[PDB]
Design a protein around this nucleic acid. Structure first.
Lengths: 96, 82, 102, 111, 109, 106, 95, 80, 98
DNA sequence: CAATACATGCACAGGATGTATATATCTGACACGTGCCTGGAGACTAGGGAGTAATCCCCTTGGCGGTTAAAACGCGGGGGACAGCGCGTACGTGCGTTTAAGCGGTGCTAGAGCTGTCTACGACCAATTGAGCGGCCTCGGCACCGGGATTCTCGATATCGAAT
DNA sequence: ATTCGATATCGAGAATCCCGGTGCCGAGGCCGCTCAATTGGTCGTAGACAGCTCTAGCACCGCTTAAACGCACGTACGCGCTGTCCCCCGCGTTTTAACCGCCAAGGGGATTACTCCCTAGTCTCCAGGCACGTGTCAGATATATACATCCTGTGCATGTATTG
């Protein structure tokens, strides 16, 4: 038969690699490392987001509690840069 | 603006905390760098607590947010709500 | 002839006596007001003019004591590791190293 | 002279010790004055009869606890003046010589 | 019906916003998820991947290599202390360890 | 006449609120009937053991009311709770009365 | 709302079932309430996981039996499985 | 059986040499095997419990990293 | 007289060798036999995927190299270079699994 | 060579001393009675997730032959581990002094908390399509191999500092 | 001036680095499918906001006494050093099973299909849990003895060193 789809971020990781390094290759095992990475950190931040929304008695995931949480997990260097481009991405998303 | 209270963790109090731990004899330069240890632990705890605080549009730090942040970092506390 | 001499114990008897005294105690061993001053001065550069519940600051008090005393038994173990009874700054550096927050 | 709460130097064996005068006793009235007011001796309070006929002072030794507090007469008490301080230094030197003789006899005992 | 434009290109991102929104919904975190939340989530994932990929690229470059190996990833994540608390309790397969020697283990003169 | 689910299950812990905490507490969009019953059952079991050990501690400390010192002795004397809740610090517990052997006088 | 919801009377009744002579402190009672809330969160979170983790989507007795043998250390476990199984047996017998 | 001694003395030496240890006592090896094996029944007990949850009686690497995810240590590149 | 290095120089050389390397330091079939015999008591007739025992391999070597770094720190603590077991029972005790 | 005093090491009296124990007392948090209201329980329906039959295939298991890198055993020896000792100093212990924490009282207010509105906004469902994933197929980065250079190691002879 | 130890250098050995060479199989791009993202519209409803209340948190102050600080004497550890022993690194030979690889077989993981059991959802009812009030005894606080117990002297059991 034709097998079911397995969820992976491989093509996006490849193209952001090309954005940061247009000539650098990638191996498959390292790419699976990266997929496990993005799944793990996404689960961490999404669990923190869902909790911190529940914890103040709120039933809606928004951008505010996840900028709060990204700042919770990611440390300073991984923080102000992340929150800054996140807000400009959100504003350019709502602008369009 | 309050300033220069870091010495407020007084020398016999650091001793007393040690003597609950079961140690006998205390080195002399323990006190100031353990005050620094309290400083780093309290700063990351209070950072998580004030982050929880300002998410709730709040200007008051709640004990709820304190035990909340302790649940986050692996140093959780009991007796102040779940 | 016979000159007096006080009732000073050997160094260590008073030690172990207050060890047994304090390992049965349950109260707080830091005074509330200085540690509250610590909490209020640390929460300045994060944001100004905070308010703290009286239960919140004492939760910080007792939590910090729990962390410090738990650091102190394995500090004692690290001091005994080098066949010593004096604890040293290297002991708690190693403790925080092997916990993984150094 | 002697005052309530003032410094004094007193005998104790062969040596001189500084003390606080907490009570002043008068033998004629069978009474003493104290510091926080005349009053008589209490139920558990007593003075040795060797000195109770002379003017006594209840004194507290400096650097030593309240178990060492005791009544002393003029024989055992002197005013805190430079003569008494100087002979206190002299008897401290005598105790130092006694300790040095102790060291000499123990080091000859080792040999 | 207008031309179908991806939410990632609408927000100027490369991780799929619709896919991570589907993972938010089907991953059972709540019954309701806001619109900009997967956008921001995709963006912070982009940021983390951007730093870890450029550090892996530097790890490949000083090793005179052009393909990323898990050893490059381990060196990249262990050389940065902030990623080191992020990934400290995490283990990397075929990663090895940082080459380090404590002082007294060196020979003396 | 309406009977509670706990008396159906023979428990004192309530099936109703723990079903509601499963539902609005946002763990899964669908939950079966027997899951809150089993959940309340295991909560009763663990609560019974920790309270019975606390009662033994209170008897040994000859106090007729539970204090968190008794709770701390209960959780720390039992080694199984010591890796169930050795991760956990509790309020007003103190520590175990332990002295290392080298610190004892000769 | 003003109503605040906790396991006060329930833990009190199981205490009376164990010891019908012993009092309880209120802050000790908050210790008990936060403790049962925390262990409830752990057991429910792992059960929701291992229900998701085999592509299931409903919460029944089998996975929470699996998770109570999994989380709790062994000694407590087999007895917890025994009491939970006889409890759900009583529940299905009484319908 | 014998396979607990299959973790050989040069292999434990290799682990120490990756761990930066210069000199190793002779009594390291057997109790290090004990530490290894107790870590093993903890992890594989969690992994097998995941395994017969799935109505399964062969184990997967996915279940292994899943048991690690429970025990706290996270592994990458083995799925998930 | 044949050339012989002093005790420790070869040891540091293959510190460098096993630290720049990434391959897996336990023989695969003995570890597989270990995993089979230690899974035997939990369930009889249990089958293991090859990637599963690879995952146990990687996790075990990571656990032991971390524990042995901790061992080297607690050994260099007591004015020493050689480790003893007592080093690693303290290393495990302070990490909270004894 | 024996004794005996001397020195060194247990046994015990005795005084401080701090802590456990007995008793009064009060007091304030524990527990018990009440009202209620909101959330759990009773009943009926939809429908859909899940249990069960089939199947196939692929991926795991078992075994058999060769080869070899690695394990095991052993000899030696040199480097740590560990015991002992001495000296200094660094807190241990204790007493006096300052002082500041701790309790009670007081007020005030800012900010937590509850209620109503309503409008932005996400949930849900039909179309559809373009991205994303399964398969295939070449190719070049890379794995393996071999020879010269480089760096490191280690041990046998000159040379300066130190003691006598 | 003489001898000796530490270091200083030269040279041999040896492990690894770097340069070609050669073949190899994962990897990146092309192709085909297919199904979840996207568009669009609606509909309920949840959170933002305004507003009102009231509670505990902040601030001050005034008396306390427990503690903080400081200092002085002492002694017991920390550590520097040395001697000695023994245990593990290093190297060699022998063994042995790890690994490749090759094939056979079959066991269950995964997928499809079906049919149905249970559960979300809704409405109604009702009683159990919680906010509130009180009275009241378990335990805190204080005070006076009892007793472990700590320290030390001193007094006797035993090694022993000197002496007659």
């Amino acid at each position: 038969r034709r097998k079911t789809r397995k969820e992976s971020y491989a093509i996006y990781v490849y193209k952001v690699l090309k954005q940061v390094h247009p000539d650098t290759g990638i191996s498959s095992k390292a790419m699976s490392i990266m997929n496990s990475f993005v799944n793990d950190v996404f689960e961490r931040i999404a669990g923190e987001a869902s909790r911190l929304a529940h914890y103040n008695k709120r039933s809606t995931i928004t951008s505010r509690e996840i900028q709060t949480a990204v700042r919770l997990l990611l440390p300073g260097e991984l923080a102000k840069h992340a929150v800054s481009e996140g807000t400009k991405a959100v504003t350019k998303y709502t602008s369009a | 603006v309050l300033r220069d209270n870091i010495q407020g963790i007084t020398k016999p109090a650091i001793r007393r905390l040690a003597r609950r731990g079961g140690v006998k004899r205390i080195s002399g330069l323990i006190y100031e760098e353990t005050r620094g240890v309290l400083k780093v632990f309290l700063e990351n705890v209070i950072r998580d607590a004030v982050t929880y605080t300002e998410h709730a549009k709040r200007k008051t730090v709640t004990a709820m947010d304190v035990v909340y942040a302790l649940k986050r970092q692996g140093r959780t506390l009991y007796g102040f709500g779940g | 002839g016979g000159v007096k001499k006080p009732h000073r114990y050997r160094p260590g008897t008073v030690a172990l006596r207050e060890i047994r005294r304090y390992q049965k105690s349950t109260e707080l061993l830091i005074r509330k007001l200085p540690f509250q001053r610590l909490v209020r001065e640390i929460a300045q550069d994060f944001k100004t003019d905070l308010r703290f519940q009286s239960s919140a600051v004492m939760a910080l008090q007792e939590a910090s004591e729990a962390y410090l005393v738990a650091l102190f038994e394995d500090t004692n173990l690290a001091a005994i590791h080098a066949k010593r009874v004096t604890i040293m700054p290297k002991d708690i550096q190693l403790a925080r190293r092997i916990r993984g927050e150094r | 002279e002697f005052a309530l709460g003032g410094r004094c130097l007193a005998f104790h064996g062969p040596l001189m010790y500084e003390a606080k005068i907490l009570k002043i006793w008068d033998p004629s009235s069978k009474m003493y004055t104290s510091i926080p007011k005349p009053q008589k001796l209490g139920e558990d309070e007593s003075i040795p009869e060797e000195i109770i006929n002379g003017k006594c002072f209840f004194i507290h030794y400096q650097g030593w606890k309240s178990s060492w507090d005791e009544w002393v007469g003029y024989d055992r008490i002197r005013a805190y003046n430079e003569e008494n301080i100087a002979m206190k230094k002299r008897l401290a030197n005598e105790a130092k010589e006694a300790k040095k003789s102790l060291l000499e006899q123990q080091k000859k005992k080792k040999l | 019906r207008a031309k179908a434009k991806t939410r990632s290109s609408r927000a100027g991102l490369q991780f799929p916003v619709g896919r991570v929104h589907r993972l938010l919904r089907k991953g059972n975190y709540a019954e309701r998820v806001g619109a900009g939340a997967p956008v921001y989530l995709a963006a912070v994932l982009e940021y983390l991947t951007a730093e870890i990929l450029e550090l892996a690229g530097n790890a490949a470059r000083d090793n005179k290599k052009t393909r990323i190996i898990p050893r490059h990833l381990q060196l990249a994540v262990r050389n940065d202390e902030e990623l080191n608390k992020l990934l400290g309790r995490v283990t990397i397969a075929q990663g090895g360890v940082l080459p380090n020697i404590q002082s007294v283990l060196l020979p003396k003169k």
